Design a protein around this nucleic acid. Structure first.
Ligand SMILES: [Mg+2]
Ligand SMILES: [Mg+2]
Ligand SMILES: [Mg+2]
Ligand SMILES: [Mg+2]
Ligand SMILES: [Mg+2]
Ligand SMILES: [Mg+2]
Ligand SMILES: [Mg+2]
Ligand SMILES: [Mg+2]
Ligand SMILES: [Mg+2]
Ligand SMILES: [Mg+2]
Ligand SMILES: [Mg+2]
Ligand SMILES: [Mg+2]
Ligand SMILES: [Mg+2]
Ligand SMILES: [Mg+2]
Ligand SMILES: [Mg+2]
Ligand SMILES: [Mg+2]
Ligand SMILES: [Zn+2]
Lengths: 151, 59, 150, 83, 112
RNA sequence: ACGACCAGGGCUACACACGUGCUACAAUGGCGCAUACAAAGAGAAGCGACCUCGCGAGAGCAAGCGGACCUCAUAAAGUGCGUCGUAGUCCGGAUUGGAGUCUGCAACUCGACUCCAUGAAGUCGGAAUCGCUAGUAAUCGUGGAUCAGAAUGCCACGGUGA
RNA sequence: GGGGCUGAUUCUGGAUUCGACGGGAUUUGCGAAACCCAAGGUGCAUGCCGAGGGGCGGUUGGCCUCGUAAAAAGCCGCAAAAAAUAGUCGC
């Protein structure tokens, strides 16, 4: 803001693994303030991915979230007044903070008989750098390579 | 008739719910199960206030 | 052998919000005016009346092939028209405040004469500031090309 | 509607003249201002002229009208049509 | 399952598989098929043909698919007789359930 | 008589537009029935613990607290596993249909409220885009107000909660 | 004054302004002016004599009513100027 810059409150973990990432992940996986069966959807995706790609959760989930990370990414500041979409850096907080959101923007598009059933495949996709979150990453890196000269 | 351009025309059965069954010549092959026959045609056979309900429903 | 007419001196004057593409009904002796390119859409604003829209004031001039004698009038309350599901709601839009709806262009598409329709706002107006944002954008981008490059 | 165990509501002296109408069976159109009741079972086919604000509207009762009221028969919504 | 011939997507429960059948739905059919012997949560799966057809008179003792459409057709015909408030609002083009028509009546009045 | 009284009607009008908002377009889920869990107030020309007829709206005659005592009243979203299991559909509930209850001199205009049947658009919305920095926003009720009767409103309180 | 050219981008050819408007056709329902009979309902009844009407007047020569003779109706003129937002602006 302007007057008092604030630092965030600290992190309280989630039950099964105690993970400070996944506790903040159940909140983006939370709609209407309900953690209850939202974390059942989380552990449903954690049942499916940590059996369809091998290793135990607390490391094996991180492969796709490593791969969908940005290096440089765009925003607008009116460097002209047109849509000169300015590319810019990113703090490592915001790296993961929008990297998880690029998973949930793909979670809002899948089509099984249950949304807990829906998320069986996106992290095993983006581990191999396929899917739709890597299409989002490819879009933002395409725009990054496009507007590179604007510095 | 001409010998060529007219379809196969045989007699099939036709039963109805009026007791009057008839089997005549048509084009399909299976029993044309009838709806209503000409005697059970409701011409002289079908068409041949609630004050009391007001006292019925309460008083 | 006439091209598309216009009444361009309205668009940077009023507010245009939502647009509709009418038809007409030409009333007896005065069509080749449009065929030749003689027109006057000066201050043509559709007074909604009787559920039956009219153009008034517009001086479509008589021709000279049709003898100028038993011709109709230059100005006439000419009965405009337009489809019911497009007409039958705009009364609630237009019948509130100092609004009229104007004519825009007596063009012709589909080999057929037309008139455009768009809801307007007012004239009792400091009509400055979006004629000011143009010179507070052009000069601003020149100034910031100067700043970013230079 | 009303709860059905009541026994519906008409005027006292106009019920007396309904009983006069069953007693008579006469065929006179009387100027009448009652609207807050039902077309009863035992008031079959006698004509009067009911209030509708300013004019007076004739109504003919029907023995198929023992569920409704006698207040829809007077439109006081001033409606000639739209335009 | 099968009542009055009008066939249906078969693998539902009968109590809501007869909802194309105009006349039986989410509460009444729970007793209607229970009179036959199948409850309101079981589908057509492993249900025998006789256990299907023990209902062709139990529904026929009530209002059936070909019955209710004609019932409300003839009932709106009878109620359209006189010319009351429900003799002009059912014909001018308005709702009759008694609501504000100066805004939001377009279910009866017309898709805007 | 620009005064005052009386019976009804109308402010709720209708092809419109302008707002303020609520259940929707579904699978965290409406669906199954008991279940893991509280605050806040309000009540005697009223609130109401009963039993039973009431599985339907209500109740007949009636037992208690002027209220840390009798109440409104057991929270729903939390959980056992399964159905319509991606369908304009068992979504989603509106226009209707008869059937019943209430309070009320009198529920048609002009009331909620109920039985059962019914199923129109709607499939995350172009532009004007508005609100919010932690118990905040979203989301679930519970009670007071005027009031015979009734609030998707306004008034407050409680769970989860980025 | 005679003579030529121009009379809808069809110019020997066939309008689709999908464009609410005037006239016609089809689908539709219950009132008698869209239609008809006296049985299903029912009493002091119909009409010709004669007579009368909203601070005030008129019309179908007639709409409510009346029995040896007189009191009450739907719409029109005198009048609520029944312009509601008024045309594009300032005074
Ligand atoms: Mg049904
Ligand atoms: Mg049901
Ligand atoms: Mg009064
Ligand atoms: Mg009001
Ligand atoms: Mg407000
Ligand atoms: Mg109370
Ligand atoms: Mg009981
Ligand atoms: Mg539950
Ligand atoms: Mg399930
Ligand atoms: Mg539903
Ligand atoms: Mg029902
Ligand atoms: Mg729909
Ligand atoms: Mg959908
Ligand atoms: Mg602040
Ligand atoms: Mg009151
Ligand atoms: Mg109250
Ligand atoms: Zn027959």
């Amino acid at each position: 803001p302007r007057r008092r810059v604030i630092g965030q409150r600290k992190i309280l973990p989630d039950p099964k693994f105690g993970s400070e990432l996944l506790a903040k992940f159940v909140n983006i996986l939370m709609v209407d303030g309900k953690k209850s069966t939202a974390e059942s959807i989380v552990y449903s995706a954690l049942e499916t991915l940590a059996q369809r790609s091998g290793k135990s959760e607390l490391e094996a989930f991180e492969v796709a979230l490593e791969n969908v990370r940005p290096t440089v990414e765009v925003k607008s500041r009116r460097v002209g007044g047109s849509t000169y979409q300015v590319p810019v850096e990113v703090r490592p907080v915001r790296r993961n903070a929008l990297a998880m959101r690029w998973i949930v923007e793909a979670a809002r598009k899948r089509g099984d008989k249950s949304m807990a059933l829906r998320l069986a495949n996106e992290l095993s996709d983006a581990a191999e750098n396929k899917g739709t979150a890597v299409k989002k990453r490819e879009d933002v890196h395409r725009m990054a390579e496009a507007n590179k000269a604007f510095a | 008739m001409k010998k060529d351009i007219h379809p196969k025309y045989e007699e099939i059965t036709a039963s109805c719910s009026c007791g009057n069954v008839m089997k005549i010549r048509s084009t399909v092959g299976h029993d044309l199960n009838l709806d209503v026959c000409s005697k059970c045609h409701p011409f002289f056979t079908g068409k041949q206030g609630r004050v009391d309900r007001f006292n019925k429903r309460f008083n | 052998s006439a091209t598309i007419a216009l009444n361009k001196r309205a668009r940077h004057e009023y507010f245009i919000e939502e647009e509709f593409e009418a038809g007409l009904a030409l009333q007896g002796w005065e069509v080749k005016s449009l065929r030749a390119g003689k027109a006057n859409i000066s201050d043509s604003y559709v007074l909604l009346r009787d559920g039956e829209a009219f153009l008034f004031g517009a001086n479509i001039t008589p021709m000279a092939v049709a003898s100028t004698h038993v011709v109709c009038d230059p100005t006439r309350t000419r009965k405009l028209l337009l489809n019911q599901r497009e007409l039958d709601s705009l009364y609630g839009r237009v019948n509130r405040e100092g609004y009229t709806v104007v004519a825009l262009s007596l063009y012709w598409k589909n080999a057929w004469c037309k008139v455009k329709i768009g809801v307007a706002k007012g004239k009792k107006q400091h009509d400055k500031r979006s004629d000011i944002k143009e010179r507070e954008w052009q000069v601003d981008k020149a100034r910031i090309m100067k700043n970013a490059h230079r | 509607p009303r709860s059905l165990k009541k026994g519906p509501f008409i005027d006292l002296h106009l019920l007396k003249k309904v009983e006069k109408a069953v007693e008579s069976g006469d065929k006179k159109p009387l100027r009448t201002w009652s609207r807050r009741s039902t077309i009863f079972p035992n008031m079959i086919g006698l004509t009067i002229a009911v209030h509708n604000g300013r004019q007076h509207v004739p109504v003919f009762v029907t023995d198929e009208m023992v569920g409704h009221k006698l207040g829809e028969f007077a439109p006081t919504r001033t409606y000639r049509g739209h335009a | 399952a099968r009542i009055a011939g009008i066939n249906i997507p078969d693998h539902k429960h009968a109590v809501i598989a007869l909802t194309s059948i105009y006349g039986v739905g989410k509460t009444r059919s729970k007793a209607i098929l229970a009179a036959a012997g199948i409850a309101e949560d079981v589908k057509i799966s492993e249900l025998s043909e006789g256990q299907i057809d023990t209902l062709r008179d139990e529904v026929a003792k009530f209002v059936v698919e070909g019955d209710l459409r004609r019932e409300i057709s003839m009932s709106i015909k009878r109620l359209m007789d006189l010319g009351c408030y429900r003799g002009l609002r059912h014909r001018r083009g308005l709702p009759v359930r008694g609501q504000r028509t100066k805004t939001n009546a377009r279910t009866r009045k017309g898709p805007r």
